[PDB]
Design a protein around this ligand. Sequence first.
Ligand SMILES: CC(C)(C)c1nc(-c2nccs2)c2c(N)c(C#N)c(N)nc2n1
Ligand SMILES: Cc1ccc(Cn2cc(C(N)=O)ccc2=O)c(C)c1
Length: 317
Amino acid sequence: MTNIQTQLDNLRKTLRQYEYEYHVLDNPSVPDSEYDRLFHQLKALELEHPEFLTSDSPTQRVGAKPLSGFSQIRHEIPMLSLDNAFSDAEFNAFVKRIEDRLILLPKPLTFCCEPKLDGLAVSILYVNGELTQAATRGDGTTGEDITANIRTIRNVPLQLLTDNPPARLEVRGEVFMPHAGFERLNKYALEHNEKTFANPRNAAAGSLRQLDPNITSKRPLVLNAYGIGIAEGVDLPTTHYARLQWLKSIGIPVNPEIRLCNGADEVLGFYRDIQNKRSSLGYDIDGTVLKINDIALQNELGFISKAPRWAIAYKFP
Ligand SMILES: CC(C)(C)c1nc(-c2nccs2)c2c(N)c(C#N)c(N)nc2n1
Ligand SMILES: Cc1ccc(Cn2cc(C(N)=O)ccc2=O)c(C)c1
């Protein structure tokens, strides 16, 4: 044991906890200055004793060297697409079809309702709690290795906040740029005669395609986790909301507007509430993602492969 290894371990634990409070809880227990005091105290100490420097330390988010290009990553579990609706009647028909298709329909039929963020879908792998890899969705089967870019995102933890992390956990979410960040970026890019972005989605896309993680770090990007891919060495909750709550309890950012709604009429109230709140969120959304909350019912309903919307095979008993 040394005093150095101990004060580095203590600084790291304290800083990760403050990052959680600030980013995930939105309830920091200390001022921004106090966090910074300890941050650059850890950074200096690590540089004075580089033998105790760790790859997942809060000070190691940004690569010093710009990359040559992005490698391609084939997802172990493919990243699926979403069905869409454009009206109340259309949404009700989607629900009436689920009601008929289920063996046993429960009363109530609970839905996990979330805002649909207007960002870029990503996959982040944590191996024994440590961030090792991150990929763009790409075409749902193959994507690009953006690990260095994802590591710069302030609300993305380099290590899970748990003493018993899964053997492997793949977190799936949307990377996006809030309005304030988007406005500052364009004001800076205008005042420095550089490329301005038409909308926050385009700014987030361009920032994640940046080969120099030093530029991505200057881009005000945010992750909101929506799902889980690989999950080994853990018994995941049996509902979708509880899985998002579990992700949040181990340090992962999830959207705070998520709610549970029983039946289509409650689900439609949520949709109208998010539509009215839309003008005050501080980030772009283009709809609401409505999911069957019970995991066993999701497994029963399963998925539909790439198929036309104009045909159906009505099978005989
Ligand atoms: C895993 C699956 C249930 C199919 C899914 N997919 C997406 C997508 N991301 C990219 C294309 S579809 C979601 C997505 N973009 C959001 C958002 N925002 C969300 N809340 N949930 C999503 N759920
Ligand atoms: C100088 C400075 C340092 C930190 C921050 C924001 N912030 C604060 C905390 C905190 N616990 O309060 C944790 C992480 C973080 O990113 C800003 C905006 C400016």
